Amino acid sequence: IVGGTASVRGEWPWQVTLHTTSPTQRHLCGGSIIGNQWILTAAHCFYGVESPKILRVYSGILNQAEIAEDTSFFGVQEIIIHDQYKMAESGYDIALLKLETTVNYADSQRPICLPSKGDRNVIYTDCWVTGWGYRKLRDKIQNTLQKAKIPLVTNEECQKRYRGHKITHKMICAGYREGGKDACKGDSGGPLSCKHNEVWHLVGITSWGEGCAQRERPGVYTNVVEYVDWILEKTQA
Numbered sequence: 657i658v659g660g661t662a663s664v665r666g667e668w669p670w671q672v673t674l675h676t677t678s679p680t681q682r683h684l685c686g687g688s689i690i691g692n693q694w695i696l697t698a699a700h701c702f703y704g705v706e707s708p709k710i711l712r713v714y715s716g717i718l719n720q721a722e723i724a725e726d727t728s729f730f731g732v733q734e735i736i737i738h739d740q741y742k743m744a745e746s747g748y749d750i751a752l753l754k755l756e757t758t759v760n761y762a763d764s765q766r767p768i769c770l771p772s773k774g775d776r777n778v779i780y781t782d783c784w785v786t787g788w789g790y791r792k793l794r795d796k797i798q799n800t801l802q803k804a805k806i807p808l809v810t811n812e813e814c815q816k817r818y819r820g821h822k823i824t825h826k827m828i829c830a831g832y833r834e835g836g837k838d839a840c841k842g843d844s845g846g847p848l849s850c851k852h853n854e855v856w857h858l859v860g861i862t863s864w865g866e867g868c869a870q871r872e873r874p875g876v877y878t879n880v881v882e883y884v885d886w887i888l889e890k891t892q893a
Contacts, residue, residue, distance in 0.1 A: 657787050658869035659837035660804035665718040668786050670768035670858070671801060671847060673720065674701065674753070675712045675729075683720060683797045686787040686846025687713065687753065688858050689767045694891055695753040697845035698861050698878065699741040702751065708732035713755060716764030720788055720799045731756035736890050738883075744844075744864040747826050750878045751845075752890050768849060768858045771881040780808055780850035780859055783830060785875065789843030793868045797842050804837040806830040808850075808859075809874050817872050826882045828860045831874030838875045840868035848877045 672695055676684040687697035695713055705711070711732040714723055736752040743749075759765055786803045790796065807830060814829035815822075823829065830848060831838055839846065839862040848860030860877030867873065 657785060657789055657798070657802035657804050657843055658791055658840050660802035663718065663786060663801040663803045666764050668801065668803070668847070668849065669716070669764060669766040671786050672713050672715045673717050673723070673788060674845065675714065675723070676705070676710050677712060678710045681712070683788055683842060685842070685844045686789070686862060688847040688861070689715060689759060689765060690770060690858065690887070691767060691891060692758040692761070693755045695755065696858065696861065696880075696887065697751050697753060698744070698749045698863055699737045699751040700744040700749050700863070701845045702735055702737065705735065708735045708753070711735075711753070713753065715759060716762070718801055720797065730759065738886065745821055747824055747878070749863040750861060750883055750886070752887065768847060768856050770884055770887065771857045771859055773881060773884065775852070775857070776881055778852060780852060782852070783808055783848060783850035783859060785830065785839045785843065785846065785848050785862060787839060787843030787846040787862065789846070790840035790868065793840065795840070806837050806875070807832065814874050814876070817874055818866065818876070823876070826879050827863070828877050828879040829874035830860070830877065833872065835869045835871035835873065838865060838869035
């Protein structure tokens, strides 16, 4: 996260840190608890990932330092990547991780509400992007979970900033005209949480951007509401 600040412990209880154990353990991507056995994240986070066996999901984490060899984690039973996914910039950057065991909800770990189709007319004015990603294009994974408040921009406005791309209605962007605050490498798969009516909704999934926090380059996110039918289909046994 560029231009953000340290999060308060338990402030984003749905935020998880997805680790890979290969070659050695490290943070791979962010993700969001949306069900007792489900994490919603980004499809492009599994590039090169041949098996879910090398994945570990850690919930209720503030500092990466809290994660040690003796720290409990959730194994991943199945990685579900949208069948239309090809690459982040072309959209459909969404994936579900079916956990081997169920998450016991508590103040430190709880699900974020999925957006409602009836709220695509709502104007989210309190949205935040979170993660342990880079604080600078050329950086490294951060210890403390960072947060940054970023305004949503219309897709028409976003398209104007990415003329070489096709910003579809299945994407949603957030950023400041002058840049300065944005998600970055390592934040991928993380949530774009927006508080509406005293309730937090998973509006977007951190996906991509032209570098990080540059002026006139809004961050691009997977427009979650466009995937609620997909999520239901893929999670409904």
